[PDB]
């Protein structure tokens, strides 16, 4: 069924993860080196065994495809994956005139009063952001995130390159290139960096009329992180093909450190008792074409029937 | 036996390679997406079924480890993998005052007189290079190759970063980082580039006392190219560990386009009738330690017993 390589990747960490400690002094059961693949013409690998919400992956990926490094598009779009790292800057910079909040994040889902106050100090931030444009401009621009990694690779000769888009022209004009790669690792910057990016690299390959893509993820959270990343790069692979008049083929997902967090071995075991239901389909509306012009109405999903959702402490 | 994942990767392309055309209008039987691994503590995966020469991998890798972009070290070292791309520049630039040579490469192993003349026009180049230092400086410096990709990532703020070395300090000081990655893809430059590099990215990971490394190769030649690349990154993995007082673990080799060239399906079939003999061992001399200080005497191999060598037309 399309998501069996996933439960199968979860199994195996449990069963041969050696403990790795990590940045956030929680635990990881870990493996290194895993590649798995999904045939995107049999369905769409949004998991059926654990609800994952696709409106959230859609606003999210699309932000990247527009060049955008600003959370306004996101809040407008009811999205907040990204919320907390702009907040982070705010809550320091001279204007944070208010209260506790510095740290939030932990003292939040393990205490004190921080649950409430803080969620409000965030919201207020988010409401100033969604209108006070001078603010939005200086505290909601995350600067270096996938959208400008992909479309404005700051050169060394004062300019911006549009890797992804550049790459999409090589697909049209010579689709058999062994080198369609978009990178999102900049060695100048990962020192000064907040989360240096996961999906380090990707490559497309066309053959027999089908596009395929391979992702390399330097670090992966089997419970919380991977459910959603498999869907960002499958949607990207559907997206790039419908623009080049290409028929879809498969997504391959490689992983350096793949790991399960210690506070997740119960919750994982819960989905593991489940049975895959048939995977949904996608419909990507035919008329429109500059992929940079897709907008959330243009990507619709059919027949998604998942098992109810599971909860996790974020561990970090 | 240690190299069975290799014959096994060769098999499978033959048997499910769909034809891909390529830059050099020869053919490829191709697959996309393959990951394979080698446990570096059972032996050293220098193939036993096809002689591969390790003095050539040694001078070669070591050049990279010194920062070096100059062929002098190589010619001194009897190496010439690299020869022909500096030649390439020579044979144009105003001073090429002499003859035919422009193209060489094809009219060479398929005609005319080009076999001889040209091999001499190369040598002469190589003898001017190995003494006339002003020349060596301007026609034997390849500029952007692994040695400066890894140790002088030209920043955008006029300077040089030493990725590899930088990364080797994070191994000592926090060996459990999910992010020890050295990249060798620069989006500014792959436009203006000769062979944009293959081994796009690599990552280390230590755990239980062992270092491991994963390579991502955007493009791979199963007959001619991979035999030697598996040995560059295994030697690197032995090299980085003996410097951090680390015990070795395994090498993983991922591949975007893995392919077999059409002029290679006989020669491949030849090794395929063979049987692996026990894989050799390495000895990396104990006293010395700045890995940047290893020199070819310091890395010795034990008991290498291979099947005689096989010939290939280079196809490109
Ligand atoms: O898109 C994402 C973002 C983060 N993570 C996970 C990976 C690690 O578990 C953690 C990042 O920690 P480092 O890998 O940066 O050390 O968050 C993912 O799985 N996918
Ligand atoms: O270290 C190397 C260098 C080159 N190649 C092969 C890969 C391709 O067959 C060809 C390069 O062609 P492109 O991938 O650049 O198109 O040479 C390798 O296998 N390993």
XYZ file of C-alpha atoms and ligand atoms in Angstrom:
672
model
C 0.000 0.000 0.000
C 1.838 3.239 -0.584
C 3.033 4.005 3.010
C 4.332 0.662 3.991
C 8.081 1.812 3.637
C 7.282 4.219 6.490
C 5.913 1.853 9.164
C 8.703 -0.399 7.948
C 11.283 2.480 8.648
C 9.642 2.944 12.111
C 9.742 -0.659 13.000
C 13.359 -1.028 12.308
C 14.497 1.985 14.305
C 12.714 0.646 17.371
C 14.226 -2.660 16.841
C 17.795 -1.586 16.092
C 18.097 1.962 17.186
C 20.991 2.311 19.465
C 20.438 5.112 21.818
C 21.883 8.423 20.476
C 21.774 11.494 22.828
C 21.053 14.714 21.052
C 21.033 18.504 21.270
C 17.855 18.650 23.241
C 18.894 16.062 25.956
C 15.955 13.794 25.126
C 16.881 10.410 23.526
C 16.944 9.067 20.150
C 16.760 5.548 18.933
C 18.768 6.049 15.718
C 19.947 4.653 12.436
C 22.007 6.189 9.776
C 21.581 5.492 6.121
C 18.068 4.658 4.835
C 16.616 5.154 1.481
C 13.006 4.354 0.734
C 10.803 4.997 -2.291
C 7.088 5.796 -3.246
C 5.595 5.283 -6.754
C 3.644 8.514 -7.063
C 1.314 7.101 -9.831
C -0.426 4.617 -7.478
C -1.750 7.300 -5.047
C -0.500 10.123 -2.730
C 1.568 9.044 0.433
C -0.256 11.209 2.947
C -0.380 8.682 5.708
C -3.660 6.860 6.332
C -2.570 5.491 9.657
C -2.196 8.929 11.455
C -3.952 11.994 10.347
C -1.596 14.538 8.950
C -3.355 17.803 7.709
C -2.596 18.737 4.091
C -3.824 22.367 4.179
C -0.729 22.828 6.364
C 1.676 21.250 3.973
C 0.147 23.132 1.110
C 0.458 26.655 2.526
C 3.799 25.712 3.722
C 5.385 24.350 0.490
C 3.774 27.110 -1.550
C 5.446 29.765 0.601
C 8.720 28.218 -0.452
C 7.757 28.212 -4.110
C 7.101 32.056 -4.008
C 10.506 33.120 -2.689
C 9.018 34.215 0.392
C 10.719 34.438 3.780
C 7.775 36.054 5.590
C 5.402 34.698 8.064
C 2.567 37.008 7.032
C 1.614 34.674 4.186
C 1.617 31.960 6.656
C -0.515 33.533 9.446
C -2.969 34.642 6.747
C -2.934 31.025 5.857
C -3.580 29.827 9.365
C -0.155 28.303 9.489
C 2.288 28.552 12.426
C 4.977 25.839 12.065
C 7.262 28.708 11.503
C 5.743 31.084 14.092
C 7.998 30.499 17.018
C 11.491 31.351 15.370
C 10.509 34.888 14.306
C 8.933 35.248 17.780
C 12.230 34.197 19.074
C 13.991 37.203 17.574
C 11.177 39.598 18.689
C 11.200 38.670 22.300
C 14.727 39.862 22.608
C 15.089 42.820 20.329
C 14.949 45.997 22.226
C 11.203 46.461 21.575
C 10.096 43.314 23.516
C 8.440 45.288 26.203
C 6.444 43.008 28.108
C 7.190 40.061 30.259
C 8.460 36.597 30.850
C 8.313 34.751 27.465
C 12.129 34.476 27.057
C 12.465 30.742 26.775
C 8.849 29.946 26.274
C 8.992 26.598 24.379
C 9.798 24.319 27.355
C 8.181 26.281 30.158
C 5.165 26.030 28.008
C 4.490 22.257 27.548
C 6.066 21.380 30.817
C 4.885 24.438 33.035
C 4.576 27.227 34.758
C 1.742 29.612 33.958
C 3.605 29.659 30.563
C 0.918 27.858 28.690
C -1.343 30.935 28.666
C 0.545 34.386 28.882
C 3.099 33.136 26.401
C 0.523 31.842 23.891
C -0.940 35.363 24.083
C 2.542 37.048 23.778
C 2.911 35.007 20.654
C -0.498 35.953 19.293
C 0.043 39.647 19.915
C 3.243 39.263 18.021
C 1.348 37.567 15.267
C -1.313 40.318 15.108
C 1.247 43.154 14.935
C 2.912 41.025 12.173
C -0.307 40.598 10.125
C -0.864 44.400 9.755
C 1.968 46.620 11.003
C 3.958 46.296 7.920
C 7.037 47.974 9.334
C 7.084 45.284 11.991
C 6.195 42.450 9.630
C 9.190 43.615 7.684
C 11.665 43.364 10.497
C 10.401 40.695 12.741
C 8.501 38.382 10.458
C 11.045 37.877 7.801
C 13.023 34.863 8.780
C 15.699 35.678 6.331
C 17.152 32.366 5.404
C 14.690 29.600 4.957
C 13.843 27.338 2.018
C 12.071 30.020 0.011
C 15.246 32.061 -0.471
C 17.532 29.185 -0.296
C 15.838 27.879 -3.418
C 15.168 31.237 -5.261
C 17.870 33.666 -4.043
C 20.964 32.051 -3.381
C 22.908 34.977 -2.344
C 25.978 34.885 -4.631
C 29.433 36.301 -3.722
C 29.242 38.864 -6.549
C 26.461 40.793 -4.822
C 23.466 39.017 -6.444
C 20.566 36.365 -6.264
C 20.218 33.021 -8.266
C 17.045 31.157 -8.741
C 18.215 27.655 -8.400
C 14.843 25.853 -8.482
C 13.526 27.811 -11.339
C 16.799 27.533 -13.171
C 16.700 23.840 -12.684
C 13.119 23.697 -14.021
C 14.336 25.174 -17.227
C 17.001 22.493 -17.639
C 14.149 19.900 -17.363
C 12.360 21.330 -20.349
C 15.405 21.869 -22.436
C 17.371 18.685 -21.677
C 15.589 16.353 -19.440
C 18.242 13.717 -19.309
C 20.831 15.779 -17.412
C 22.505 13.760 -14.609
C 22.718 17.003 -12.755
C 19.330 18.715 -11.876
C 20.107 19.415 -8.137
C 18.846 22.241 -5.971
C 20.895 22.603 -2.782
C 19.886 24.321 0.337
C 23.087 24.016 2.280
C 25.262 27.167 2.328
C 28.491 26.662 4.178
C 28.876 30.358 4.830
C 25.741 30.485 6.797
C 25.149 27.266 8.782
C 27.424 28.795 11.558
C 25.121 31.832 12.050
C 22.094 29.508 11.705
C 18.996 28.706 13.617
C 17.911 25.243 12.300
C 20.403 24.672 9.415
C 18.011 22.971 6.926
C 17.198 19.266 6.855
C 16.336 18.538 3.331
C 19.910 19.277 2.405
C 19.678 18.579 -1.306
C 17.318 17.252 -3.996
C 17.683 16.007 -7.476
C 15.248 15.339 -10.335
C 15.775 12.842 -13.120
C 13.338 12.330 -16.027
C 13.204 9.148 -17.947
C 10.494 7.455 -20.062
C 8.282 10.478 -19.639
C 8.314 10.430 -15.870
C 9.943 12.800 -13.417
C 11.353 11.419 -10.174
C 13.078 13.248 -7.273
C 15.276 12.207 -4.510
C 15.606 13.990 -1.241
C 18.445 13.845 1.173
C 17.593 14.687 4.672
C 20.459 15.085 7.074
C 18.256 14.544 10.073
C 14.823 13.005 10.491
C 12.134 12.650 13.200
C 10.264 9.424 12.331
C 7.211 10.361 14.355
C 6.614 13.984 13.887
C 8.926 15.100 11.183
C 8.780 12.503 8.471
C 4.885 12.218 8.027
C 4.919 15.715 6.683
C 8.198 15.779 4.818
C 7.199 12.869 2.521
C 4.279 14.992 1.530
C 6.195 18.173 0.851
C 8.489 16.448 -1.616
C 5.816 14.371 -3.236
C 3.816 17.480 -3.813
C 6.847 19.116 -5.261
C 7.372 16.237 -7.564
C 3.754 16.518 -8.716
C 4.129 20.248 -9.112
C 7.297 20.344 -11.228
C 5.950 17.682 -13.566
C 2.527 19.273 -14.393
C 4.538 22.455 -15.414
C 6.949 20.585 -17.739
C 4.014 18.378 -19.161
C 5.408 15.400 -17.506
C 3.908 12.304 -16.162
C 4.845 11.358 -12.575
C 7.062 8.507 -11.499
C 8.479 8.066 -8.044
C 9.831 9.956 -4.903
C 12.855 8.532 -3.050
C 13.681 9.746 0.437
C 17.166 9.303 1.805
C 18.107 9.921 5.361
C 21.388 10.467 7.221
C 20.338 10.268 10.868
C 16.868 8.809 10.918
C 15.629 8.575 14.512
C 12.648 8.017 16.822
C 12.549 10.110 20.025
C 12.386 8.464 23.316
C 9.013 10.187 24.120
C 7.547 8.716 21.066
C 7.902 4.951 21.493
C 4.277 4.633 22.738
C 2.615 6.794 20.222
C 4.556 5.079 17.342
C 3.413 1.706 18.638
C -0.095 2.990 18.456
C -0.020 3.536 14.606
C 1.791 0.275 14.281
C -1.235 -1.681 15.225
C -3.034 -0.138 12.389
C -3.705 -1.117 8.869
C -3.145 1.111 5.887
C -6.280 2.149 4.125
C -6.013 2.897 0.301
C -3.949 5.998 -0.245
C -5.695 9.240 -1.595
C -5.302 10.821 -5.069
C -4.330 14.391 -6.131
C -5.986 16.741 -8.629
C -3.963 19.722 -9.638
C -6.121 21.928 -11.638
C -5.524 21.626 -15.346
C -5.815 25.088 -16.622
C -3.005 26.770 -14.704
C 0.731 26.347 -15.266
C 3.397 28.646 -13.852
C 3.969 26.456 -10.853
C 4.874 29.703 -9.112
C 1.354 30.655 -9.749
C -0.317 27.840 -7.997
C -2.347 28.954 -5.114
C -3.968 26.622 -2.562
C -7.271 26.170 -4.602
C -5.387 24.674 -7.418
C -4.131 21.649 -5.543
C -7.011 19.439 -4.265
C -6.799 15.890 -2.708
C -9.479 13.098 -3.192
C -10.810 10.589 -0.817
C -8.636 10.934 2.336
C -9.767 8.491 5.028
C -7.253 8.380 7.917
C -7.177 6.868 11.297
C -7.767 9.623 13.884
C -4.744 11.645 14.998
C -1.983 10.802 17.747
C -0.351 13.309 20.209
C 3.201 13.871 20.882
C 5.022 16.104 23.142
C 7.231 17.964 20.676
C 10.471 16.735 22.271
C 12.695 19.846 21.365
C 32.341 -10.669 1.267
C 32.821 -6.933 1.398
C 32.181 -6.028 -2.304
C 29.108 -8.023 -2.939
C 26.802 -4.833 -2.865
C 28.768 -3.730 -5.946
C 28.351 -6.736 -8.272
C 24.818 -6.718 -6.911
C 24.440 -2.975 -8.040
C 25.898 -3.988 -11.468
C 23.634 -6.893 -11.935
C 20.542 -4.949 -11.345
C 21.349 -2.108 -13.721
C 21.861 -4.592 -16.540
C 18.698 -6.255 -15.688
C 16.506 -3.186 -15.208
C 18.338 -0.314 -16.717
C 16.137 1.423 -19.131
C 18.161 3.045 -21.771
C 19.029 6.692 -20.880
C 20.856 8.792 -23.568
C 23.424 11.126 -22.151
C 25.692 14.099 -22.807
C 28.251 12.090 -24.658
C 25.770 10.339 -27.091
C 26.805 6.881 -25.891
C 24.106 4.932 -23.945
C 23.385 4.296 -20.440
C 21.481 1.533 -18.817
C 20.294 3.502 -15.761
C 18.643 3.478 -12.388
C 18.010 6.236 -10.006
C 18.077 5.853 -6.281
C 20.447 3.245 -4.772
C 22.036 3.162 -1.444
C 24.481 0.461 -0.471
C 26.748 0.010 2.542
C 30.240 -1.460 3.541
C 31.267 -2.351 7.140
C 34.770 -0.912 7.146
C 35.902 -3.102 10.148
C 35.725 -6.386 8.168
C 38.293 -5.328 5.494
C 38.885 -2.610 2.818
C 36.461 -2.601 -0.275
C 39.117 -2.262 -2.951
C 37.602 -4.664 -5.393
C 39.122 -8.139 -5.674
C 37.302 -8.963 -8.857
C 38.984 -6.219 -11.055
C 42.263 -4.703 -10.244
C 41.945 -1.115 -9.244
C 45.351 0.573 -8.325
C 45.439 2.188 -4.871
C 48.585 4.328 -5.333
C 46.295 6.287 -7.675
C 43.518 6.746 -5.212
C 45.976 7.662 -2.530
C 47.773 10.481 -4.357
C 44.487 11.585 -5.564
C 42.528 11.825 -2.259
C 45.544 13.293 -0.493
C 45.704 16.149 -3.001
C 42.197 16.995 -1.902
C 43.107 16.842 1.766
C 45.922 19.492 1.243
C 43.776 22.214 -0.321
C 45.503 21.838 -3.449
C 44.140 22.636 -6.903
C 47.395 21.953 -8.774
C 48.393 19.173 -10.980
C 52.084 19.436 -10.114
C 51.566 17.345 -6.981
C 49.849 14.905 -9.118
C 52.389 14.558 -11.987
C 55.121 14.288 -9.343
C 52.971 11.540 -8.040
C 52.639 9.796 -11.358
C 48.979 10.614 -11.435
C 47.056 11.927 -14.474
C 43.295 11.418 -13.904
C 43.196 15.125 -13.768
C 45.731 15.806 -16.555
C 43.461 16.345 -19.478
C 41.233 19.297 -18.077
C 44.171 21.644 -17.394
C 45.515 20.586 -20.823
C 42.194 21.567 -22.113
C 42.634 25.179 -21.041
C 46.275 25.273 -22.317
C 45.564 24.130 -25.794
C 43.435 27.145 -26.375
C 44.997 29.975 -24.471
C 46.931 32.194 -26.718
C 50.236 30.404 -25.980
C 49.172 27.018 -27.498
C 51.572 27.287 -30.331
C 51.739 24.064 -31.879
C 49.300 21.918 -33.699
C 46.193 19.855 -33.933
C 45.341 18.695 -30.353
C 42.134 20.800 -30.064
C 39.648 18.068 -29.363
C 42.091 15.338 -28.633
C 40.053 12.984 -26.369
C 37.932 11.309 -29.089
C 40.291 11.577 -32.036
C 42.642 9.829 -29.756
C 40.951 6.483 -28.835
C 39.038 6.347 -32.038
C 41.722 7.813 -34.550
C 43.568 9.643 -36.572
C 47.293 9.940 -35.945
C 45.959 11.483 -32.654
C 47.111 8.668 -30.481
C 50.760 9.766 -30.728
C 51.297 13.608 -31.417
C 48.599 14.427 -28.907
C 49.989 12.154 -26.166
C 53.255 14.056 -26.710
C 51.480 17.506 -26.738
C 50.088 16.469 -23.415
C 53.438 15.345 -22.041
C 55.183 18.529 -23.110
C 52.462 20.353 -21.309
C 53.076 18.196 -18.305
C 56.856 18.812 -18.364
C 56.502 22.611 -18.621
C 54.005 22.235 -15.697
C 56.409 20.214 -13.490
C 59.138 22.944 -13.544
C 58.143 26.252 -15.150
C 56.473 27.539 -12.130
C 54.951 30.544 -13.846
C 53.206 28.126 -16.173
C 52.321 25.620 -13.465
C 50.689 28.558 -11.785
C 48.446 29.508 -14.644
C 47.781 26.373 -16.512
C 48.013 23.668 -13.903
C 45.775 25.094 -11.306
C 42.354 23.766 -12.004
C 40.789 26.294 -9.772
C 37.684 24.638 -8.522
C 38.027 21.025 -7.662
C 37.469 19.065 -4.450
C 40.567 20.371 -2.701
C 39.258 23.942 -2.583
C 35.703 23.001 -2.510
C 36.402 21.316 0.805
C 39.014 23.798 2.270
C 38.249 27.197 0.675
C 34.780 27.683 0.086
C 34.926 31.046 -1.359
C 32.499 33.070 0.803
C 30.539 36.149 -0.397
C 32.329 38.399 2.118
C 35.643 38.072 0.287
C 37.047 35.064 2.219
C 37.783 31.207 2.460
C 36.146 28.576 4.850
C 37.596 25.259 5.661
C 34.556 23.135 5.684
C 36.188 19.703 6.105
C 38.522 20.805 8.764
C 35.803 22.749 10.488
C 33.661 19.700 10.438
C 36.498 17.607 11.920
C 36.527 19.878 14.883
C 32.808 19.386 15.501
C 33.537 15.594 15.639
C 35.939 16.009 18.504
C 33.901 18.497 20.396
C 30.396 17.052 19.937
C 30.347 13.877 18.057
C 26.643 13.351 18.130
C 25.724 16.312 15.908
C 23.069 15.380 13.296
C 24.761 17.868 11.071
C 28.465 17.104 10.130
C 28.114 17.689 6.308
C 30.728 18.930 3.878
C 29.177 20.068 0.592
C 30.890 20.468 -2.664
C 28.067 21.910 -4.681
C 28.201 25.703 -5.179
C 25.239 27.013 -7.081
C 27.109 30.103 -8.172
C 29.623 28.105 -10.018
C 28.101 24.964 -11.591
C 27.081 27.213 -14.612
C 30.720 28.194 -15.364
C 31.774 24.584 -14.635
C 33.706 21.876 -16.320
C 32.561 18.632 -14.568
C 30.334 20.000 -11.734
C 31.333 17.512 -8.974
C 29.778 14.093 -8.441
C 30.171 13.410 -4.826
C 27.782 16.236 -4.131
C 27.695 15.975 -0.358
C 28.900 13.826 2.557
C 28.000 13.460 6.142
C 29.664 11.810 9.152
C 27.860 10.464 12.186
C 29.620 8.943 15.224
C 27.904 6.558 17.504
C 29.149 3.843 19.905
C 32.709 4.876 19.219
C 32.509 4.418 15.483
C 32.522 6.988 12.710
C 30.442 6.355 9.597
C 30.038 8.499 6.439
C 27.548 8.661 3.733
C 28.221 9.894 0.269
C 25.765 11.192 -2.220
C 26.815 10.945 -5.758
C 24.662 12.692 -8.299
C 25.990 10.599 -11.127
C 27.807 7.281 -11.230
C 29.647 5.081 -13.774
C 29.256 1.504 -12.464
C 32.185 0.192 -14.464
C 34.841 2.768 -14.397
C 33.758 5.347 -11.933
C 32.431 3.513 -8.934
C 35.401 1.015 -8.309
C 37.511 3.969 -7.383
C 34.993 6.193 -5.666
C 34.147 3.553 -3.010
C 37.792 3.612 -2.160
C 38.180 7.360 -1.930
C 35.407 7.646 0.630
C 36.374 4.589 2.582
C 39.854 5.933 2.871
C 38.456 9.209 4.000
C 36.407 7.503 6.601
C 39.519 5.702 7.851
C 41.459 8.934 7.796
C 39.058 11.146 9.763
C 38.641 8.501 12.444
C 42.366 7.819 13.213
C 42.691 11.663 13.779
C 39.732 11.887 16.211
C 40.825 8.549 17.992
C 37.866 6.822 16.642
C 37.170 3.313 15.725
C 35.717 2.703 12.239
C 32.197 1.637 11.417
C 30.664 1.730 7.984
C 30.586 3.672 4.596
C 27.241 4.129 2.805
C 27.168 5.181 -0.828
C 24.057 6.748 -2.269
C 23.533 7.387 -5.907
C 21.157 9.561 -7.943
C 21.739 8.353 -11.499
C 23.649 5.118 -11.245
C 24.363 3.776 -14.737
C 26.332 1.286 -16.850
C 27.536 2.517 -20.268
C 26.557 0.730 -23.336
C 30.258 -0.007 -24.205
C 30.675 -1.694 -20.945
C 28.127 -4.523 -20.945
C 30.795 -7.082 -22.004
C 33.514 -6.064 -19.693
C 31.047 -5.934 -16.711
C 29.901 -9.445 -17.561
C 33.486 -10.497 -17.394
C 33.901 -9.571 -13.639
C 30.517 -11.042 -13.008
C 31.740 -14.511 -13.600
C 34.212 -14.028 -10.896
C 34.302 -14.797 -7.263
C 35.297 -12.346 -4.583
C 38.498 -13.187 -2.834
C 38.877 -11.989 0.864
C 39.094 -8.232 0.965
C 42.479 -6.542 1.996
C 43.241 -4.648 5.244
C 44.632 -1.109 5.845
C 47.458 0.060 8.116
C 47.653 3.751 8.692
C 50.776 4.449 10.505
C 50.261 4.996 14.196
C 52.608 7.721 15.071
C 51.285 10.510 12.864
C 48.059 12.467 13.326
C 47.238 15.719 11.553
C 45.357 13.972 8.808
C 46.500 16.888 6.668
C 49.916 15.619 7.326
C 49.509 12.183 5.979
C 51.689 11.522 3.067
C 51.499 8.406 0.868
C 53.957 6.314 3.072
C 51.662 6.577 5.969
C 48.779 4.705 4.410
C 49.720 1.084 3.511
C 47.374 -1.789 2.370
C 47.875 -5.549 3.278
C 47.354 -8.611 1.265
C 45.696 -7.407 -1.989
C 45.041 -10.335 -4.333
C 42.848 -9.259 -7.285
C 41.754 -10.808 -10.466
C 43.770 -9.273 -13.331
C 42.510 -5.994 -14.788
C 39.687 -5.335 -17.525
C 39.779 -2.657 -20.323
C 37.240 -0.171 -21.194
C 37.025 2.426 -23.767
C 36.459 5.507 -21.622
C 33.066 6.278 -23.187
C 33.174 10.181 -22.736
O 11.548 19.393 8.327
C 11.980 18.953 9.404
C 12.595 19.759 10.461
C 13.178 19.144 11.608
N 13.168 17.812 11.735
C 13.850 17.279 12.937
C 15.158 16.617 12.660
C 15.790 16.499 14.027
O 15.083 15.516 14.827
C 15.521 17.883 14.570
C 16.584 18.841 14.108
O 17.752 18.671 14.981
P 19.188 18.770 14.287
O 19.042 17.672 13.290
O 19.242 20.091 13.649
O 20.280 18.499 15.222
O 14.213 18.211 13.996
C 12.564 16.961 10.758
O 12.390 15.755 10.864
N 12.021 17.571 9.634
O 34.327 10.653 -9.699
C 33.676 10.436 -10.733
C 33.623 11.319 -11.899
C 32.745 11.046 -12.989
N 31.953 9.968 -12.959
C 31.042 9.811 -14.117
C 29.609 10.097 -13.816
C 28.980 10.222 -15.183
O 28.930 8.926 -15.835
C 30.000 11.098 -15.873
C 29.737 12.546 -15.566
O 28.665 13.006 -16.458
P 27.600 14.022 -15.837
O 27.101 13.179 -14.714
O 28.369 15.177 -15.359
O 26.527 14.349 -16.775
O 31.266 10.644 -15.290
C 31.968 9.044 -11.868
O 31.384 7.971 -11.826
N 32.811 9.336 -10.802
